Scaffold this active site. Structure first.
Site, PDB file in Angstrom:
ATOM      1  N   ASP A 214      35.427 126.225  86.886  1.00 36.93           N
ATOM      2  CA  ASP A 214      34.611 127.432  86.228  1.00 36.93           C
ATOM      3  C   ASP A 214      33.257 127.232  86.944  1.00 36.93           C
ATOM      4  OD1 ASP A 214      33.826 125.154  85.003  1.00 36.93           O
ATOM      5  OD2 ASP A 214      34.431 126.014  82.885  1.00 36.93           O
ATOM      6  N   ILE A 215      32.737 126.230  87.133  1.00 37.92           N
ATOM      7  CA  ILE A 215      31.609 125.781  87.658  1.00 37.92           C
ATOM      8  C   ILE A 215      31.405 124.674  88.428  1.00 37.92           C
ATOM      9  CG2 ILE A 215      30.472 124.546  85.831  1.00 37.92           C
ATOM     10  CD1 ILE A 215      27.953 126.506  85.982  1.00 37.92           C
ATOM     11  N   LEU A 216      30.369 124.750  89.502  1.00 39.31           N
ATOM     12  CA  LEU A 216      30.291 123.543  90.351  1.00 39.31           C
ATOM     13  C   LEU A 216      28.776 123.197  90.438  1.00 39.31           C
ATOM     14  CD1 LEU A 216      31.345 121.417  92.420  1.00 39.31           C
ATOM     15  CD2 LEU A 216      31.512 123.405  93.976  1.00 39.31           C
ATOM     16  N   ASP A 217      28.613 121.893  90.063  1.00 38.08           N
ATOM     17  CA  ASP A 217      26.929 121.480  89.846  1.00 38.08           C
ATOM     18  C   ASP A 217      26.772 120.319  90.764  1.00 38.08           C
ATOM     19  OD1 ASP A 217      24.377 121.736  89.173  1.00 38.08           O
ATOM     20  OD2 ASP A 217      24.893 120.704  87.542  1.00 38.08           O
ATOM     21  N   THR A 218      27.051 119.123  90.135  1.00 37.50           N
ATOM     22  CA  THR A 218      26.636 118.018  90.911  1.00 37.50           C
ATOM     23  C   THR A 218      27.826 117.655  91.641  1.00 37.50           C
ATOM     24  OG1 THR A 218      27.754 116.442  89.020  1.00 37.50           O
ATOM     25  CG2 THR A 218      25.460 117.158  88.897  1.00 37.50           C
ATOM     26  N   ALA A 219      29.039 118.344  91.693  1.00 33.52           N
ATOM     27  CA  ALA A 219      30.424 118.182  92.139  1.00 33.52           C
ATOM     28  C   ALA A 219      30.775 116.951  92.287  1.00 33.52           C
ATOM     29  CB  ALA A 219      29.869 118.295  93.699  1.00 33.52           C
ATOM     30  N   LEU A 220      30.660 116.282  91.019  1.00 33.69           N
ATOM     31  CA  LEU A 220      31.345 114.824  90.603  1.00 33.69           C
ATOM     32  C   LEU A 220      32.663 114.902  90.210  1.00 33.69           C
ATOM     33  CD1 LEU A 220      28.052 113.099  88.936  1.00 33.69           C
ATOM     34  CD2 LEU A 220      28.939 112.748  91.509  1.00 33.69           C
TER      35      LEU A 220
END
Ligand SMILES: Nc1nc2c(ncn2C[C@@H](COCP(=O)(O)O)OC[C@@H](O)P(=O)(O)O)c(=O)[nH]1
Ligand SMILES: Nc1nc2c(ncn2C[C@@H](COCP(=O)(O)O)OC[C@@H](O)P(=O)(O)O)c(=O)[nH]1
Lengths: 178, 177
Positions: B90-96
């Site tokens: 749904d979302i991509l932030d720190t991509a961890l």
């Protein structure tokens, strides 16, 4: 006339038919739980999504519920944490033998919630192994195997927007798991 | 003036998202054209990551269906060896989260792996990672709606919105006595 899908004998319920019914259901749910003082964070309606295919029905319903001012919180049993004292609405895509819903409801009661009701998208009342009645039913189909709207045959046809009867030729030809 | 007493503004509406998702679906269909995707036999294996991605997953597979792309979903695996895998989040932030999942799926020797995110936050990376398909981008702000939550709430919001600061403050209800 002819069918729209080459893998289906007929279309029982279209996406539009389902949504139209789901608004009527959401209206009743909005009325029934109007005296529960439902609020986001504080006291949201705990939506328990049972079975893997119910993610399509759950995703659509909670948004329709949100339109009718009903704050929700989802849990997936495809759980039993932090539901004590709160209202629980169990969602499931299909219902016939009622064995799945029965065990889940009797298991959620152990955590002792404020209340607990069930909402199904497709109900097959003629498939009961035990007596069971969903508080809210979107649609009814007879004792035929259906696919679409989350419902699958061997992990396929979930993405079908309509609830259709799967062709007998399909699940016998695919009888190749041997 | 958005119709949300709990939000300051609406970043992306449901209509905006779906419009973009069709455009993505067209590219995904074109890209996987040489993959010979068929229901039952060789479908595109959708791997839905994170709990709140069920909204994005539900819509996207149906839009993928409209463009002639058969799919099967798995939620976070086995039985993926030799099969094409599209990882949805749904979302991509720190991509961890995606980095761990993608690398873990590589151990099962799939046909191919790509990632599809609904909301990418490029400026939130703690490690470098690029998704093959991105529906929309947002700057470094906390958003809810379309599956995205704030303490398990506001997932049902059809639009991707920024919560009003009064929401977290009022939810500062620390009556834990
Ligand atoms: N597609 C489809 N499935 C059906 C149908 N009738 C029963 N089932 C199985 C159902 C059992 O649940 C009902 P019950 O007997 O427990 O009441 O479980 C669904 C899992 O396949 P899923 O993919 O994990 O959701 C039907 O007509 N069509
Ligand atoms: N609502 C919201 N959440 C965010 C945002 N940025 C990151 N997150 C958390 C995300 C981490 O994933 C990205 P990454 O760091 O792994 O790349 O995980 C979501 C699970 O908590 P969910 O509730 O189950 O969906 C944001 O702007 N808004």
């Amino acid at each position: 006339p002819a069918c729209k899908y080459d893998f289906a004998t007929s279309v029982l319920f279209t996406e539009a038919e389902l949504h139209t019914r789901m608004r009527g259901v959401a209206q009743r749910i909005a009325d029934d739980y109007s005296n529960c003082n439902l609020k986001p964070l504080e006291n949201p309606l705990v939506i328990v999504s049972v079975l893997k295919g119910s993610f399509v029905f759950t995703a659509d319903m909670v948004r329709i519920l949100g339109d009718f001012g009903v704050p929700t919180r989802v849990e997936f049993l495809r759980g039993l944490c932090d539901i004590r004292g709160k209202h629980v609405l169990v969602l499931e895509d299909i219902l016939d033998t009622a064995l799945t819903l029965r065990e889940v409801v009797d298991s959620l009661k152990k955590s002792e919630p404020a209340s607990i009701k069930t909402l199904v998208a497709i109900d097959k009342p003629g498939g009961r192994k035990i007596p069971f009645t969903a508080e809210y039913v979107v649609a009814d189909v007879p004792n035929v195997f259906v696919v679409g709207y989350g419902l699958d045959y061997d992990q396929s046809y979930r993405e079908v927007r309509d609830v259709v009867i799967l062709k007998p030729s399909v699940y016998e030809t695919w009888g190749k798991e041997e």
